[PDB]
Amino acid sequence: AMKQAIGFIDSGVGGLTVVREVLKQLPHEQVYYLGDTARCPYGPRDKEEVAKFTWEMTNFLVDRGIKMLVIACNTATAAALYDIREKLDIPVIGVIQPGSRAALKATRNNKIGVLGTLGTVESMAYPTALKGLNRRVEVDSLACPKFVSVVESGEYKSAIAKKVVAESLLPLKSTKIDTVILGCTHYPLLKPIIENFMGDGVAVINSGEETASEVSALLDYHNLLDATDEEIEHRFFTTGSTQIFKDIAKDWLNMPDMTVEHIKLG
Amino acid sequence: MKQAIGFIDSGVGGLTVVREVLKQLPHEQVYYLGDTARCPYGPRDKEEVAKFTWEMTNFLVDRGIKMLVIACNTATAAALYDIREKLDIPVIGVIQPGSRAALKATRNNKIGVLGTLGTVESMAYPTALKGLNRRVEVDSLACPKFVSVVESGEYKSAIAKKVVAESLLPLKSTKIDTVILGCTHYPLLKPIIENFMGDGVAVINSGEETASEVSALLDYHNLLDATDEEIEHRFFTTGSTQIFKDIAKDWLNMPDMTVEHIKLGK
Ligand SMILES: [Cl-]
Ligand SMILES: [Cl-]
Ligand SMILES: [Cl-]
- Pick the closest to residue A179 from A99, A125, A249 (CA basis): A99
Q: Do residues B91 and B117 lie in contact, with contact meaning Cβ atoms separated by under 8 Å?
A: no
What does the H/E/C string look like for chain A?
CCCCEEEEEECCCCCHHHHHHHHHHCCCCCEEEEECHHHCCCCCCCHHHHHHHHHHHHHHHHHHCEEEEEECCHHHHHHHHHHHHHHCCCCEEECHHHHHHHHHHHCCCCEEEEEECHHHHHHCHHHHHHHHHCCCCEEEEEECCCHHHHHHCCCCCCHHHHHHHHHHHHHHHHCCCCEEEECCCCHHHHHHHHHHHHCCCCEEECCHHHHHHHHHHHHHHCCCCCCCCCCCCCEEEECCCHHHHHHHHHHHCCCCCCCEEECCCC
Say how far apart CA A37 and CA A58 lie, in whole Å.
15
**CB neighbours of residue A254 within 10 Å:** 8
Q: Do domains A1-94+208-266 and A95-207 have the same CATH topology?
A: yes
Q: CA torsion, points A75, A80, A81, A82, in degrees to nearest 10?
A: 140
**Count of residues making up chain A:** 266
The answer to whether the Cβ–Cβ distance between A220 and B96 falls below 8 Å is yes
Strand partners, A113: A140, A180
Q: CA of A24: how far to CAs of A28, A56, A207, A230, in Å? A: 10, 28, 14, 18
For domain A1-94+208-266, give the fold. Rossmann fold (3.40.50)
Architecture of domain B94-206: 3-Layer(aba) Sandwich (3.40)
The CATH class of B2-93+207-266 is alpha beta
Q: Do residues B102 and B127 lie in contact, with contact meaning Cβ atoms separated by under 8 Å?
A: no
Q: CA of B84: how far to CAs of A222, B19, B67, B69, in Å? A: 10, 24, 10, 11
Q: Do residues B95 and B173 lie in contact, with contact meaning Cβ atoms separated by under 8 Å?
A: no
Say how far apart CA B56 and CA B71 lie, in whole Å.
12
Strand partners, B234: B31
The answer to whether the Cβ–Cβ distance between B92 and A221 falls below 8 Å is yes
Say how far apart CA B180 and CA B210 lie, in whole Å.
13
Identify the residue among A26, A101, A218, A228 best suited for mutation to test binding to B, counting B beta carbons within 10 A and taking the highest.
A101
Q: Do residues A157 and B248 lie in contact, with contact meaning Cβ atoms separated by under 8 Å?
A: no
Say how far apart CA A91 and CA A24 lie, in whole Å.
20
Residue A5, φ and ψ in degrees, nearest 5:
-75, 150
Domain ranges of chain A: 1-94+208-266, 95-207
**Which positions of B make up the binding site for substrate?**
9-10, 41-42, 73-74, 184-185
Nearest CA in chain A to B217: A218
CA of A182 to the centre of ligand 2 (A): 13
A253 lies within 8 A of chain B by CB: no
Single-letter code of the amino acid located at A83:
D
Asked how this structure was determined, the answer is X-ray
CA of A226 to the centre of ligand 1 (A): 30
Say how far apart CA A13 and CA A148 lie, in whole Å.
9
The answer to whether the Cβ–Cβ distance between A25 and B100 falls below 8 Å is yes
Query: Hey, CA dihedral for B91, B130, B9, B248, is it positive or negative?
Result: negative
For domain A95-207, give the fold. Rossmann fold (3.40.50)
From the CA of B115, the nearest ligand is 3
Q: CA torsion, points A84, A86, A91, A97, in degrees to nearest 10?
A: 70
Say how far apart CA A248 and CA A154 lie, in whole Å.
6
From the CA of A123, the nearest ligand is 1
Q: Do residues A155 and A164 lie in contact, with contact meaning Cβ atoms separated by under 8 Å?
A: no
Identify the residue among B108, B220, B229 best suited for mutation to test binding to A, counting A beta carbons within 10 A and taking the highest.
B220
Say how far apart CA B48 and CA B46 lie, in whole Å.
6
Say how far apart CA B235 and CA A168 lie, in whole Å.
49
**CB neighbours of residue B37 within 10 Å:** 16
Q: Do residues B192 and B164 lie in contact, with contact meaning Cβ atoms separated by under 8 Å?
A: yes
The answer to whether the Cβ–Cβ distance between A133 and B228 falls below 8 Å is no
Say how far apart CA A101 and CA A96 lie, in whole Å.
9
Taking contacts as CB-CB distances below 8 angstroms, the residues of chain A near B133 are 26-28
Say how far apart CA A34 and CA B238 lie, in whole Å.
54
Cα A265 from chain centroid (whole Å): 20
Q: Which long-range contacts (CB under 8 A, 24 or more apart) does A248-257 make?
A: A248/A13, A248/A16, A248/A151, A248/A152, A248/A154, A248/A189, A249/A13, A249/A16, A252/A13, A252/A16, A252/A17, A252/A20, A252/A189, A253/A16, A253/A19, A253/A20, A253/A23
**Count of residues making up chain B:** 266
Say how far apart CA A12 and CA A40 lie, in whole Å.
7
